[PDB]
Amino acid sequence: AIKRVGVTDVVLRDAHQSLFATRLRIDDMLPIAQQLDQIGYWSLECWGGATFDSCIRFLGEDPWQRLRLLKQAMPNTPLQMLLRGQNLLGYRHYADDVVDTFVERAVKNGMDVFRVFDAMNDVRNMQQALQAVKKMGAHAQGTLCYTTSPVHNLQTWVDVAQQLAELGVDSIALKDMAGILTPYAAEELVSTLKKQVDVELHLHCHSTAGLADMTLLKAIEAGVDRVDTAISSMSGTYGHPATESLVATLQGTGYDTGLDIAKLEQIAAYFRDVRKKYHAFEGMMKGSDARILVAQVPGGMLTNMESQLKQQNALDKLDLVLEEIPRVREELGFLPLVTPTSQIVGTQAVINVVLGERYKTITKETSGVLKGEYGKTPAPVNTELQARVLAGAEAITCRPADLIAAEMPTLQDRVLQQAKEQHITLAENAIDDVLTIALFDQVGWKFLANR
Amino acid sequence: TQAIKRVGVTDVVLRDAHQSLFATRLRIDDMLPIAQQLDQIGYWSLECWGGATFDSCIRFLGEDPWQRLRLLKQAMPNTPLQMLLRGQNLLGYRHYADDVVDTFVERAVKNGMDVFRVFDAMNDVRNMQQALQAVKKMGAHAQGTLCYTTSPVHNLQTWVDVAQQLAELGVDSIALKDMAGILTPYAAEELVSTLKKQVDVELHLHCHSTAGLADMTLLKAIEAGVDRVDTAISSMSGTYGHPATESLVATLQGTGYDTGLDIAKLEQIAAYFRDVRKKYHAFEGMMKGSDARILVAQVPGGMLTNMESQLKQQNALDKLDLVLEEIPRVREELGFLPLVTPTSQIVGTQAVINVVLGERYKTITKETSGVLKGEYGKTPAPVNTELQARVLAGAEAITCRPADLIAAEMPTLQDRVLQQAKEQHITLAENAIDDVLTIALFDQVGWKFLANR
Ligand SMILES: [Zn+2]
Ligand SMILES: [Zn+2]
């Protein structure tokens, strides 16, 4: 049943993260904030993802002060973030109290909509954060990270989507970080999900392999409720389809977003000038990258792998590494090649090729996947390698966060003391700084000392 | 609905891609080492000539355009070669005499041209007629062209009419050509549906990515039954150019439209062009993403760029909105001529003048006069009366095909060229008529090149 399609703009988060290393500063945002807020977007994505790490590591911005500045700039349009479930914006699984504290504080500082994902689509890692988002009156969007494999099919996707609907989520996001979701695969998967699961659907696709404009359009024809787009001047390549373009397309159809091309083009003009300033951080790809089309290796993965193959010399072994990825991926139970898992498969595959021996040196990360430390892989991992890193302990088959003790009081302890010992002034809400240290440790301490 | 079948693909990497993306500078020496791989793909055709390449060859690259073609045909024996040809204007600056048109086409074919996408900026079929007819006579493929536009006098029946007019000439296929990137996906669905149902010819789509619509437009056109699309090898695709070849191939793989093209083979060619495109960074434009200004009111990017140059040179630039408000009014008063090169700069320039002077048509340009006089051909709708009558004398407007009034040029050009060539110690080609064509089309620029070849 055809109805108005809702739009979330990613310009203030994933566009810049994807386009120029997450370097967009808050003072480049605020002058165009009132105009963004008057558009009628379903939500504006403007936090989480790599913006926390960028804020504290490169920009000299407090991520929480940024949030409050945006929310004051933009009273009408709900703010969206991307949050990696039990990992939050950090490097490891955290205790439940850390998760709960983070959502509260994010909502207090002005956050509305929460897109909560897990790289393996193990719904258990999403549960606590979704729970707390719902508990904080906020809007919970549970996520499926799209992938392709011998063990992912319509039946598997529907049952994950169902588990999330069962958790009470407010909507479900379908996210294709690599841009590998084809238009006709999108048509089928969305249609199917709209037949089986009683939830609003919201699609996120990258333009990196050139599929994303066609994909969003085929998902809209199959009935997707919402899509993510970027402002025209901040779209394309590594990022996302243009807003105006998909706005123009749906005009005078039943899907008509009702967005104003003229009011949108003004914002695009603003960002065209802003984007020029950041030219030093732009990747080198022009058009789209067909390499990704060949074997579903995401472009960010190929980059990271080639670098490692540079810093060992022997870049001529690239083709062997490429044939190694599928082998290593199967052995680790067909985990999606999605951040930060893709780097685990890539590093290990590079090691398997360089060292001339399959699994001679096994990384801390490959081991942890096998031992169940990240959750349930889509298909059971290889037993011959698992037992070899267990020798002979048991596998973790529970939600890893069941095994980790409460952190917030012991952490709150360390932070207030060290801050005083180091003569560091903490925020008006000290807990926010405690959270920064939880997630980024020394990087967070260096930021707080310099704030 | 049209029957579902394999979509044909034309790759424009050797012509329109780099014309669009780096000032038409791609050299032959960068084309030939990938040529055998391109020929093994199974493209329906490879667009590798015409447009601005002839000019670029002689004006910037020190290449003989005829010789490029021969090298390309040599290197790519199994794939039909394709060119863009502006009807009576050939690749030149004015309407030429029929004997020149006939001579060019015969020479294009004997050098190795197989497919001729023949067009006219106004969609006046009489300007396309001689070239199409000459193409047919040579046993080559004649693709007549509709140049897409949006106007109060343009609609489905009107596009049907033009396509029908071309069908009656016996064209082998009909191209739909969106140079500006303004053809929306659903308008394309509607238009392609109507043409496939009402006119009995193969349809071939060309759309530019400039405004972000082309990927979606090509897909919706395919669903509506279009027979062929133009794409560009991925590393040579996007922004000012065209949808990516591999992206479309992957999208169609295992569907009823399955092109049957090998993605791994295509990617190899793309990895090649990625490096090559690096070398031409100097000539790249500044646009990143899509151009949403095109979407506001259908002003092509090139047209705006050119109007803003004129305004800044004047000055001023703060009269831009007024000039933008002026275009719609001028275009009507000029019979809703498509905003397509070279007719867009006719509208743009006249409009800039009207605003800068402070009086509308205080000054009428040589080109606006020509449009009012019927010297270019028939406008989609009657021009403004009596702006037309202000220009003639008043005489009566020209209502015929312009090439009816031009005297035969080839005998008097062949002699002129041959005598100037010997007196200036300039060695001509094995088939000297090709140089005579080079000079016919480009005058001084041609002479300059022949003198230094
Ligand atoms: Zn993303
Ligand atoms: Zn073109």
Side-chain angles (χ1 to χ4, degrees), chain A residues 5-287:
Chain A
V5 174
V7 192
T8 290
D9 212 294
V10 291
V11 64
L12 303 179
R13 200 287 292 190
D14 201 29
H16 74 257
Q17 178 160 334
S18 302
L19 292 182
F20 53 95
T22 330
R23 303 311 181 97
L24 195 58
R25 293 182 179 276
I26 187 74
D27 313 280
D28 277 325
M29 291 179 192
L30 300 171
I32 200 72
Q34 195 185 324
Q35 277 184 47
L36 280 169
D37 198 42
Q38 304 302 319
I39 294 295
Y41 286 124
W42 184 72
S43 74
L44 284 153
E45 194 197 51
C46 64
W47 215 55
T51 63
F52 204 106
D53 177 61
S54 194
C55 266
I56 59 181
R57 183 158 69 106
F58 305 121
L59 296 181
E61 280 177 51
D62 186 89
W64 307 102
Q65 162 167 59
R66 172 175 281 204
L67 191 24
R68 296 190 296 266
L69 283 191
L70 292 166
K71 185 39 123 166
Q72 155 186 281
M74 306 179 299
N76 311 321
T77 306
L79 309 183
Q80 195 173 125
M81 71 171 292
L82 189 82
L83 185 57
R84 179 152 89 88
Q86 201 73 17
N87 280 249
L88 302 164
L89 306 175
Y91 62 106
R92 63 167 174 89
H93 283 236
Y94 297 95
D96 283 335
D97 62 348
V98 188
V99 171
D100 291 347
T101 305
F102 185 91
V103 163
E104 192 175 314
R105 294 319 299 167
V107 151
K108 305 275 143 158
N109 281 304
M111 184 64 46
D112 311 314
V113 198
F114 280 83
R115 180 176 298 177
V116 181
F117 77 103
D118 178 75
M120 269 179 191
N121 296 309
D122 176 339
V123 170
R124 304 170 301 181
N125 297 335
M126 276 177 273
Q127 196 182 306
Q128 191 70 31
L130 285 165
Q131 184 172 134
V133 169
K134 292 182 43 74
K135 201 139 289 220
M136 286 300 327
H139 175 125
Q141 179 172 100
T143 308
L144 318 176
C145 293
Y146 180 78
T147 193
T148 264
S149 99
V151 309
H152 290 86
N153 51 56
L154 284 184
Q155 168 274 303
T156 67
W157 292 121
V158 172
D159 291 339
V160 184
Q162 249 312 306
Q163 283 180 296
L164 288 179
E166 282 178 23
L167 286 178
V169 301
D170 278 291
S171 52
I172 299 179
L174 179 65
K175 192 180 111 288
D176 165 28
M177 190 179 287
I180 52 164
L181 172 64
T182 75
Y184 292 122
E187 171 174 55
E188 185 186 51
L189 174 63
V190 173
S191 294
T192 299
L193 286 178
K194 304 287 289 170
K195 278 193 186 83
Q196 279 290 338
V197 191
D198 189 33
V199 276
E200 282 173 19
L201 258 181
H202 195 142
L203 179 71
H204 185 96
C205 188
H206 279 256
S207 305
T208 321
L211 297 181
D213 300 357
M214 290 179 294
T215 293
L216 279 55
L217 179 67
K218 298 306 306 181
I220 284 172
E221 297 183 339
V224 92
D225 299 285
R226 297 188 278 286
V227 294
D228 278 2
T229 52
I231 283 287
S232 52
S233 47
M234 297 274 276
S235 61
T237 60
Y238 302 97
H240 310 91
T243 306
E244 295 93 304
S245 296
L246 184 80
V247 184
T249 293
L250 304 181
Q251 280 197 344
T253 78
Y255 306 114
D256 207 326
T257 73
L259 300 199
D260 183 70
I261 301 173
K263 282 154 161 16
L264 279 165
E265 187 287 327
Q266 289 184 54
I267 292 160
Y270 174 90
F271 278 103
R272 180 165 305 274
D273 298 323
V274 175
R275 187 169 173 193
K276 279 182 179 209
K277 314 206 268 173
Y278 290 94
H279 60 274
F281 299 106
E282 299 256 13
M284 309 293 288
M285 95 125 72
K286 297 185 177 309

Side-chain angles (χ1 to χ4, degrees), chain B residues 194-413:
Chain B
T194 302
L195 292 169
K196 287 311 275 156
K197 193 199 278 281
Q198 300 199 37
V199 189
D200 183 34
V201 286
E202 288 161 6
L203 261 189
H204 199 137
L205 184 63
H206 183 92
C207 192
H208 278 257
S209 304
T210 323
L213 301 169
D215 288 6
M216 298 186 274
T217 286
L218 253 51
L219 194 51
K220 285 322 292 204
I222 283 164
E223 285 182 356
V226 80
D227 299 80
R228 286 189 288 273
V229 302
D230 275 14
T231 54
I233 279 290
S234 66
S235 47
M236 302 274 274
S237 73
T239 61
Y240 312 100
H242 310 90
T245 298
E246 305 96 304
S247 289
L248 188 65
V249 171
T251 298
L252 298 190
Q253 206 166 252
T255 69
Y257 317 107
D258 189 294
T259 62
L261 302 199
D262 192 57
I263 294 163
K265 265 156 168 31
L266 283 156
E267 187 279 328
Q268 287 212 147
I269 297 165
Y272 174 87
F273 274 104
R274 184 177 290 105
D275 286 342
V276 168
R277 182 174 179 180
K278 275 177 196 289
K279 307 201 299 181
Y280 295 88
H281 166 71
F283 309 113
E284 292 267 2
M286 289 305 106
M287 200 243 309
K288 293 263 191 291
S290 303
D291 199 344
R293 303 174 294 187
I294 302 157
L295 296 180
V296 175
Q298 280 71 241
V299 181
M303 195 192 186
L304 179 63
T305 304
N306 174 250
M307 292 180 298
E308 63 187 25
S309 272
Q310 293 194 41
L311 277 169
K312 184 200 145 207
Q313 293 178 168
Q314 218 82 222
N315 47 53
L317 208 50
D318 67 342
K319 299 300 191 80
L320 178 56
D321 294 340
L322 294 167
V323 168
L324 289 177
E325 285 163 35
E326 185 65 12
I327 307 156
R329 300 193 286 242
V330 168
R331 202 199 156 192
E332 177 178 5
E333 298 179 47
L334 285 171
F336 291 116
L337 21 47
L339 298 193
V340 166
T341 311
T343 52
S344 53
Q345 295 208 172
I346 297 166
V347 177
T349 302
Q350 186 63 52
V352 164
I353 295 174
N354 287 346
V355 173
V356 168
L357 294 185
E359 179 156 1
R360 311 185 69 187
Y361 308 106
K362 219 283 170 208
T363 310
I364 315 161
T365 44
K366 194 215 167 194
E367 293 88 4
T368 308
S369 283
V371 171
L372 295 155
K373 277 166 167 155
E375 300 188 334
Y376 292 72
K378 190 171 186 276
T379 63
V383 290
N384 186 280
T385 183
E386 53 201 72
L387 263 163
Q388 188 193 42
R390 207 229 273 196
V391 177
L392 276 150
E396 205 229 337
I398 297 153
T399 51
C400 83
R401 161 207 189 250
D404 290 342
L405 310 175
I406 312 166
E409 307 200 309
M410 288 309 294
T412 86
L413 267 50

Side-chain angles (χ1 to χ4, degrees), chain A residues 265-336:
Chain A
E265 187 287 327
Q266 289 184 54
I267 292 160
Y270 174 90
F271 278 103
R272 180 165 305 274
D273 298 323
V274 175
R275 187 169 173 193
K276 279 182 179 209
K277 314 206 268 173
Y278 290 94
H279 60 274
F281 299 106
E282 299 256 13
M284 309 293 288
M285 95 125 72
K286 297 185 177 309
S288 46
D289 188 356
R291 284 182 293 212
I292 308 188
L293 280 195
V294 176
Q296 283 67 57
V297 171
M301 181 174 178
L302 189 56
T303 306
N304 179 68
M305 283 188 299
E306 277 169 330
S307 276
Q308 294 175 181
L309 273 164
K310 274 179 184 279
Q311 307 210 245
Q312 314 265 344
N313 196 46
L315 188 71
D316 67 303
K317 293 178 196 174
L318 175 48
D319 283 316
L320 302 187
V321 164
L322 301 176
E323 298 166 31
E324 193 69 27
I325 295 164
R327 296 201 278 284
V328 180
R329 194 194 171 196
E330 177 161 12
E331 282 159 316
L332 296 178
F334 290 120
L335 29 55

